[PDB]
Amino acid sequence: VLRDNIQGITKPAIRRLARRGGVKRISGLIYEETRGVLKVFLENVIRDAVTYTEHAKRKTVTAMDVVYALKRQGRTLYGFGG
Amino acid sequence: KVLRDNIQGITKPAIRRLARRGGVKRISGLIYEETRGVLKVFLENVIRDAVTYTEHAKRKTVTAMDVVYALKRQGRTLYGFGG
Amino acid sequence: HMALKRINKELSDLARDPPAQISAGPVGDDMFHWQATIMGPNDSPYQGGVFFLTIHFPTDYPFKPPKVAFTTRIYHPNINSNGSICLDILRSQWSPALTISKVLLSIASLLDDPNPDDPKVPEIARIYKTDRDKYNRISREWTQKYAM
Amino acid sequence: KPHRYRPGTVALREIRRYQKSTELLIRKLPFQRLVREIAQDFKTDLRFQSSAVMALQEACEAYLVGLFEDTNLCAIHAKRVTIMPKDIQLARRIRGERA
Amino acid sequence: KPHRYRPGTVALREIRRYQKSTELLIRKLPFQRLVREIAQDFKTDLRFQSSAVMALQEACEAYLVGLFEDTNLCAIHAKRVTIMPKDIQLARRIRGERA
Amino acid sequence: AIPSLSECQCGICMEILVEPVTLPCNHTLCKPCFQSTVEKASLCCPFCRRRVSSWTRYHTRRNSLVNVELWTIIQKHYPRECKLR
Amino acid sequence: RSRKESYSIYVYKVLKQVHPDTGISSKAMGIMNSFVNDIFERIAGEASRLAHYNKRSTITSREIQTAVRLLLPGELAKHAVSEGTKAVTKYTS
Amino acid sequence: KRSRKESYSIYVYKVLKQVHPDTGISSKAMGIMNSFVNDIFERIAGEASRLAHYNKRSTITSREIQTAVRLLLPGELAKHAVSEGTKAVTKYTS
Amino acid sequence: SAKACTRSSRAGLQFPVGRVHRLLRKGNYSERVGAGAPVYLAAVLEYLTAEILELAGNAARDNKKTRIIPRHLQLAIRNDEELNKLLGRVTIAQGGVLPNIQAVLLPKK
Amino acid sequence: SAKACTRSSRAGLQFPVGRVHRLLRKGNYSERVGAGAPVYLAAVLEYLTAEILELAGNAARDNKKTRIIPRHLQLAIRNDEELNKLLGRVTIAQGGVLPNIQAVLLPK
DNA sequence: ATCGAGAATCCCGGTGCCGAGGCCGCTCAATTGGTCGTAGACAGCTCTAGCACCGCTTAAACGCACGTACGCGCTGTCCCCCGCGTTTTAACCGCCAAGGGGATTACTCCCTAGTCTCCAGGCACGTGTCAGATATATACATCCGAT
DNA sequence: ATCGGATGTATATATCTGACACGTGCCTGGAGACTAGGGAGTAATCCCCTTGGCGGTTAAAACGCGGGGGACAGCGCGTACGTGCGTTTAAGCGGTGCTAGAGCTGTCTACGACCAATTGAGCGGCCTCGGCACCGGGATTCTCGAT
Ligand SMILES: [Zn+2]
Ligand SMILES: [Zn+2]
C-alpha cells in the first residue's frame, strides 16, 4: 500500500515544466492546481490501460496498453510502438 | 450567373442575435468583420469535403448525406438529417 | 526541335570522338531512328563477335528513355533472346544527362561482368553459380556458331 | 419625458429571449446564396438539395453560438463586459482552430 | 558588493536552457511510485513494464507543457506576466477538459 | 570573375544556360529543363539522382527557383547568346 | 421503390414502455435513429479493434462488454454492463 | 529464437539513402518513423473503407485511395501525393 | 430459454437481435461474429434509448406537452452530466441552448 | 510494364507492394481489394516518408551531426506548416518543443 | 547617451566506448499459373425535385441622433516572488538473487459459416381526428424617475 | 425607501388545421435443420524480466533572508456603443412551368478470390569500428552598478 505520493511532484519540477512551457513568473498557488490536474490526467489514462490489460487476461501493464489508451483519447505517442 | 460579395448578407443584426443566444451583453464595433471571416473559413472547410464526397460518387448534386459525412469527418457530428 | 537539337549535338560529339569498341549511326532517313554495333572485349568469353542493336527515340526526349533492342542472341544472364536487356538505365534509373555513348559503354561494361541479381533468363545464372567451366564452354560455342 | 430603458436591460431581455427559442437566426436566402458562391468556387455547375443547405446552416449557427460563448468567457477573464476581436482570436487559438 | 541578478533574468535564462534540451524533468522514482499508487487503486496486485512507466511519463510531461503554454497565453491576455490558477481553469474550460 | 563558356553550358539540353537553377547537390541546369524534369521525370536530380521532394515545393511556393547571382552574370557578361536563346 | 430500414418502431415501443402517455414527433424520431446508429458504430468499432489487438478473429460478448466499459462513463457503463449481462444470461437458457 | 516481427526499417533506410546519401539514422528515430508509417497507413485505409461502404460498393480500388488521400492530407501535400500515386500506378500497369 | 419464440422475446428485449446480428456480420468488423454479441449489443442500445426517452419525457411533461420535440431532447441530454459527457461533440438540430447568464452581467443592486 | 521482375520495381518504388496488398486484404477493411490499390498506397507512404526524412536530415546537418535523432524529427515536423497540420495531435518521444518566448516577457 | 568587472556560454583539442551498419544462415510468405463465379460497367427508361420567374405584404434591415457608462491610462501602496547561500534528504547507479508470469507448442472438440426451404414481421400507402399554434382580451411583475 | 406610470410578459378561451397514430397488403429478410472444419480453449514447459535489497556519492530539494518589481485598487476623461424612431429594402409566401438528373432494371464481360508448388526477400543473431559523449582549458558575450 502507498499513501500521498502526489507530493513527489515537487515545486522545482513544476517550475521546470513551466520554464519549458515559456513561463517567466509563477504565482504560489500554481503547484497544488498542477498536481490536481496531473492526477486527473493520470487517472484517466491508467484506467483505460488497466482495462486493456484485464481484457487480455494478463497481469503486467505492457507499453502497448498505454499506447492504445493514449490513442483512444487523441494523444497519439510515437516512439514506443504502434 | 456568377455571385459576388454575398457575405454581406450576414448582416449586423444577425450577428447580434447570434451573440445574444450565446449570452453576450455588450459587443464591440469590430466584431462583425472578424465573425464574417471565421464563418467564411468554416464554410469553405466544410463545403470542400462535401464537394469531394459528391464528386467521388460521380454525382452532380450535393445531398444532405454528403454534408453530414463531411461534418462528422471534421469532428462535429450532426443529428436530425440522417445517418 | 529541342530533341532534334539534342541529337545534333550528340552527333557532333560522337563523330569528333569515336568510342572504344563501339560503333553507331542513323539506320534510316529520319533522325529519330538509330542503329549501333558492339564487340566483345578482350577479357570476355564472347571475344571475336559482332553484335548489332536497334535504337528508337520517343517523341519526348531526353526526359523519356530511348528504346534499345538486340537483334542477335548472346549468352548473358541479363540478355533475353527477344532483344530486351536488364539495365537500370532503360526504365528505372533513366536520366536526361545520360547519352547514347554512355549507355552503350554501360552495356559493354555489363558484358564484361555479369550481374545475375535481376536475371531475365533463370537457368543461365544457376549454371554460372554452380560451375563456371560449363558456362564458359557453352558461351564459347554459342559465340562461335552465332556471333560469326 | 418619453420612457426609455437604461443601456443594458434590453440586452439582457434579448439574451433571455433567444436562449429560450430554437429557430434559426440568419436569413435563409443570403445564406443559400453564400453557400452556392463558395461551392462554385470549388466545383462549377453544382445543384444543392434543400436538406444540404439546411444542414449547413444548422452546423454554422451552432458553431458560431459556441464560439461566442467562449469569446464571452475570454472577455470576462480580462475584467470586461465588451467582447473584442482579440477575445475571438484567443478563443480560437486555445481551441486549436488556428494554433 | 556581492553580485546579484535583477529579478527576471535567470528566469529567461532558464526558459532558454529548458527549450533547447529534450530530457525528462520529473524524477523517475516518485513518478513510478505515483503511477503504482493509482494503478493499485484501480486493480490490486499489478505489475508494470519499464516501457509502460516511461510512456506514461512522456505523455504526462507533454500534456503539462502544452497546458502551461495555454496558461501563459491566458495570463498575457489579462495584462499580466504571472500565471495564476484562474488562468489554468480558463484554458481547461475553453479546451473542453473540465466543461 | 567570369567563368568560361565551357562550364556555362547546360548538359541536359546542350545549350546555353537560361534562368539557371542549382540543386542542393550543386548541379546547375536550365529552368525549362527543371520544369520539364519535374513534370515528367521522377522529381530527382537528372545528374546524380539526388531527389528534392520538398525543396521544389518550398521554393515554388516563394518563387526562388532561379539562381539569380549566376543568371545576372550570364545575362550581362554574355549578352549575345541570351537574346538569340 | 426502395425499402429503408430504421429503428423507429422499437424506439416507439420503448417510449410506450416508459411513458404510456407521451408521443413523439418526426424530428425527434430522426434524432433517435441517428443516435442509435452512432452508438452502434462506436461500440462495434471498439470491439473490432479490441479483437484485432489480441489476434482473435471473433467478436464475442466479452469484446462488446469491454468496448462498453471503454466508451461509456462510470454509472452509465455499470448499468449498461448489467443490462447486457442479464440479457445474455436470459438468452442462453 | 523469437518469433518474426515485420517492420518498415529496411525500406525507410533505403529511402533515407536517397535524400541524404551520407546521413545515418538512430534506432529511436527508426521506431518513430515506423510508427508514423503505420499510423498513416491505418488512416488512409480506414477512410477508403468508409468511402467504399458509403457508396454500396464492395471493392477498394485506387479511386477510393485517391479520394481518401484528398480528404485526409492538407492542401499542398495532397496535390503531390496524388501525383506520385497516379504516376506509380500508370508506370506499374504498362 | 424455450428456443421457440422470437429471438428478441427469447432474450427479453424490444430491439431486434436478428438485424443487429446481420449488421455485425455484413459491416466489415470481424471475420466471424459470435453468437452472444448481438444480444448484448441490443440490450445496451435499448438501455441507452430508454434512459434518454425517460429524461426527455420528463422535460416534455415539465413543459405541459404530450409530444417530444428536439428541444425536449436537448434539455434532457445537456442537463444530465453523464449523458452530456457521452454526447459531447454532438450537435442536435433545432435543439437550442441551455439558458444561463454570467453573474457579472446581471444588474448591480 | 513488362513482368518477370520484383513487384515493387515495376512501379519504381522502394516500399513493398506485396506486403501492403496483404495488409489491405487481411485488415478487415473491405470484402475485396483491387489490383491497383496497394501500388497507390505504397507510393503515397513512400512520398511522405521521403518528405519527412529530407527535412530531418537538413536539421541534423544544421546541428553539426551526421545522424538523425528524435529532436531533428520534431524540428522538421514543427517548422513545416503542412507537416505540422498533418501531425497535429501526435506526440514525439524525446522531441522537446520549439524555442520561442513572448515579446512581452523580454526585458525592456 | 557610455566604461569596466564578474559571470555565463560557446569553441577547440584529446580520449574512450558502445551501438549503428554490414554480413551469414534460413525458413515462410510472396510469386506464378490455372479456374470460376459474380461485381459492376454500360445502355435504356421513369418521374422527382431542383431551378427559374412573377406578384404582393410586411417584417426586418438601415441610417440618424442623444446620452451615459464603460474602457483605458495614470498614480500609489504593499507584499510576495525572485535570486542567493547553507544544510539535509533521497535519487541514481551498480550489483546480486529469486521466481512470477509471459510466450510458445501440441491436442482436441464445439461453435460458427454455408445452404436450402419457408413464412411472418416490418415497410409503403391511405385515412381520420385532436394537440398545438394563433388570435384576443386581462392580470401581474418589473423598470425607472422623484421624492 | 416608496410611490405611480408605463412597459413588457404571463395567463385564460375559441378554433381550426395538418401531422401523428393506426390499419391493410405483401414480400423480402430472418428463422429452422443439417453438415464440415478450423479457431480457440486447455494443459505443460521454458526462461525472461520484474521485483526486492544494500551500499555509496552527490545532484537536487528544502529552508531562510533581503528587496524590488508586479498585482491591485481608486480617479478621471471621453468616446464608442445602446436605445428609440422614421424610412427604405428585399425576404418570405403562393403559384406555375420545365427539364436535368437521381434512381431502378437487364445483359454480360472482365477482374478478383482460391488453391498448390517453389524459391528468394527479409528477419534473427554476430561483430566491429567510427560517431558522439565527456573533460579540460581558453575565447566570446550579455549583465549590472557607476558614471
Ligand atoms: Zn538546359
Ligand atoms: Zn545532382
DSSP string of chain J? Answer: --SSS-HHHHHT-SS-HHHHHHHHHHTTS-SEE-SSHHHHHHHHHHHHHHHHHHHHHHHHHHTT-SEE-HHHHHHHHHHSHHHHHHTSS-EETT--------TTTS--
- Check whether residue I26 has its CB closer than 7 Å to nucleic acid strand L: no
Distance I32 CA to K113 C1' (A): 8
Q: Are the C-beta atoms of C35 and C53 separated by less than 8 Å?
A: yes
CB contact under 8 Å between A63 and E51, yes or no, is yes
Q: Are the C-beta atoms of C31 and C4 separated by less than 8 Å?
A: yes
Residue of I nearest to B80 (CA): I93
Could you tell me the three cell numbers for A17? 515544466
Q: Which CATH superfamily is domain B6-74 in?
A: Histone, subunit A (1.10.20.10)
Could you tell me the three cell numbers for G71? 466508451
Kindly report whether the peptide bond that precedes residue C62 is cis, defined as omega within 30 degrees of 0.
Answer: yes
How close is the Cα of C60 to the center of ligand 1, in Å?
Answer: 15
Q: Over the Cα atoms of chain F, what is R_g?
A: 13
Angle (deg, nearest 10), helices A30-55 and E50-77: 140
**What's the rounded Cα separation, in Å, for the pair D31 and D36?**
9
CB contact under 8 Å between F42 and J12, yes or no, is yes
Which residue has cell 536539421? J59
| CB-based burial label for C17 (10 Å; 0-12, 13-18, 19+) | exposed
Q: What angle do CA I72, I75, I79 make, to 5 degrees?
A: 145
In a domain, F38, yes or no: yes
**What's the rounded Cα separation, in Å, for the pair C93 and F44?**
10
Protein-proximal nucleotides of chain L (any atom < 7 Å from a CB) = 5-9, 19-21, 28-32, 39-41, 49-51, 60-62, 67-72, 80-85, 90-92, 100-104, 111-113, 120-125, 131-132, 143-145
Nearest-CA neighbor of A46 among E93, G75, I92, E32? Answer: E32
Distance B9 CA to K55 C1' (A): 24
E2 to chain I, any CB pair closer than 8 A? The answer is no
Q: Are the C-beta atoms of B38 and D67 separated by less than 8 Å?
A: yes
**What's the rounded Cα separation, in Å, for the pair E94 and I78?**
17
At residue J49, φ and ψ (nearest 5 deg) are: -60, -45
Amino acid at C17: D
H93 to chain F, any CB pair closer than 8 A? The answer is no
DSSP β-bridge partners for residue F30: F20
Indicate contact of A with G: 3+ CB pairs under 8 A: yes
CB contact under 8 Å between D58 and I91, yes or no, is yes
> Which CA-bearing residue is nearest the C1' of L72?
E80
Domain boundaries, chain I: 7-86
Q: What class is the A6-72 domain?
A: mainly alpha
- Which of H14, H15, H18 is the best substitution to test chain F (most F C-beta atoms within 10 A)? H18
Residue of B nearest to G41 (CA): B83
Q: Are the C-beta atoms of I28 and I41 separated by less than 8 Å?
A: no
Q: Checking DSSP bridges between strand I90-92 and strand B77-79, what pairing results, if any?
A: parallel
Q: Which nucleotide is nearest to H13 (CA to C1')?
A: K21
- Tell me if residue C60 is catalytic: no
CB contact under 8 Å between A77 and J105, yes or no, is no
Which domain range does residue F50 map to?
20-84
Nearest-CA neighbor of H91 among C92, F48, F49, C59? Answer: C92
Q: Checking DSSP bridges between strand F28-30 and strand F20-22, what pairing results, if any?
A: antiparallel
**What's the rounded Cα separation, in Å, for the pair E90 and D72?**
12
Question: Which CATH code for domain D9-94?
Answer: 1.10.20.10
**What's the rounded Cα separation, in Å, for the pair D82 and B6?**
28
**What's the rounded Cα separation, in Å, for the pair B22 and E83?**
28
Angle (deg, nearest 10), helices G74-91 and G61-71: 160
> Which CA-bearing residue is nearest the C1' of L48?
H2
Could you tell me the three cell numbers for G8? 423507429
Q: C: neighbours with 3+ CB pairs under 8 Å?
A: F, J
Residue of E nearest to I84 (CA): E99
- Check whether residue J67 has its CB closer than 7 Å to nucleic acid strand L: yes
**What's the rounded Cα separation, in Å, for the pair J54 and H28?**
17
Whole-angstrom distance between the N-terminal and C-terminal Cα of chain C?
40
Number of structural domains chain C divides into:
1
Which residue has cell 541578478? E5
- Check whether residue D19 has its CB closer than 7 Å to nucleic acid strand K: no
- The phi-psi region of residue E13 (left if phi > 0; otherwise alpha if psi is between -120 and 50; otherwise beta) is alpha
CB contact under 8 Å between B23 and I102, yes or no, is yes
What is the maximum alpha-carbon separation in chain E? 60
| Distance to chain I for D81, nearest Cα, Å | 7
E21-95: CATH architecture = Orthogonal Bundle (1.10)
- Check whether residue G2 has its CB closer than 7 Å to nucleic acid strand L: yes
In a domain, F5, yes or no: no
Query: What's the CATH number where G64 sits?
Result: 1.10.20.10
Interface B:H, Cβ pairs < 8 A: 15
How close is the Cα of F18 to the center of ligand 2, in Å?
Answer: 18
Which domain range does residue H44 map to?
9-93
At residue F35, φ and ψ (nearest 5 deg) are: -65, -45
Which ligand is nearest the CA of F55, by number?
2
The experimental method is cryo-EM
Q: A44 contacts in G (CB within 8 Å)?
A: none
**Interacting residues of E7 by C-beta distance below 8 A, sequence separation 6+:** none
Q: E57 contacts in A (CB within 8 Å)?
A: none
- C47-80: buried (b, 16+ CB within 10 Å) or exposed (e) per residue? eebebebebebeeebbbebbebebeeebbbbbbb
**Interacting residues of C30 by C-beta distance below 8 A, sequence separation 6+:** none
- Among chain I residues 36-55, those with CB within 7 Å of any atom of strand K: 36
Q: Which nucleotide is nearest to D49 (CA to C1')?
A: K50
CB contact under 8 Å between H80 and F53, yes or no, is yes
J47 to chain F, any CB pair closer than 8 A? The answer is yes
How close is the Cα of F39 to the center of ligand 2, in Å?
Answer: 18
H76 to chain F, any CB pair closer than 8 A? The answer is yes
H54 to chain B, any CB pair closer than 8 A? The answer is yes
Query: What are the Cα distances from residue F23, in Å, to A43, F61, I63?
Result: 52, 16, 73
Domain boundaries, chain A: 6-72
**Interacting residues of C17 by C-beta distance below 8 A, sequence separation 6+:** none
Query: What are the Cα distances from residue G68, in Å, to A37, A65, G24, I24, J45?
Result: 26, 17, 28, 16, 34
In this structure, which topology does domain I7-86 adopt according to CATH?
Answer: Histone, subunit A (1.10.20)
Q: What is the DSSP letter of C35?
A: E
SS3 I92: strand
**What's the rounded Cα separation, in Å, for the pair D44 and D38?**
10
DSSP β-bridge partners for residue A26: E83
**What's the rounded Cα separation, in Å, for the pair B42 and B10?**
14
Distance I30 CA to K118 C1' (A): 30
Number of structural domains chain F divides into:
1
Query: What are the Cα distances from residue C94, in Å, to C62, C63, F40, F44?
Result: 9, 8, 12, 11
**What's the rounded Cα separation, in Å, for the pair A52 and A61?**
8
Residue of E nearest to D70 (CA): E94
Query: What are the Cα distances from residue F80, in Å, to E31, F5, F83?
Result: 75, 12, 6
CB contact under 8 Å between B67 and D59, yes or no, is yes
Q: Are the C-beta atoms of B10 and D26 separated by less than 8 Å?
A: yes
CB contact under 8 Å between D73 and E95, yes or no, is no
DSSP β-bridge partners for residue I90: B77
Residue of G nearest to A48 (CA): G70
**What's the rounded Cα separation, in Å, for the pair E21 and J74?**
12
SS3 E41: helix
Q: Are the C-beta atoms of G63 and G51 separated by less than 8 Å?
A: yes
| Distance to chain A for G19, nearest Cα, Å | 36
Q: Are the C-beta atoms of A82 and H7 separated by less than 8 Å?
A: no
Query: What's the CATH number where F33 sits?
Result: 3.30.40.10
**Interacting residues of F2 by C-beta distance below 8 A, sequence separation 6+:** F73, F77
Q: Are the C-beta atoms of A60 and E48 separated by less than 8 Å?
A: yes
Instruction: Please provide the DSSP assignment of F38-53 as one string.
Output: HHHS-SS-TTT----H
Three-state DSSP string of B12-80: HHHHHHHHHHCCCCEECCCHHHHHHHHHHHHHHHHHHHHHHHHHHCCCCEECHHHHHHHHHHHCCEEEC
Protein-proximal nucleotides of chain K (any atom < 7 Å from a CB) = 6-9, 19-21, 28-33, 39-40, 49-52, 60-62, 67-72, 80-85, 90-92, 100-105, 111-113, 121-125, 131-132, 143-145
Could you tell me the three cell numbers for C136? 564458359
Give CA torsion, residues B36, B42, B48, B53, to 10 deg: -140
CB contact under 8 Å between I107 and D19, yes or no, is no
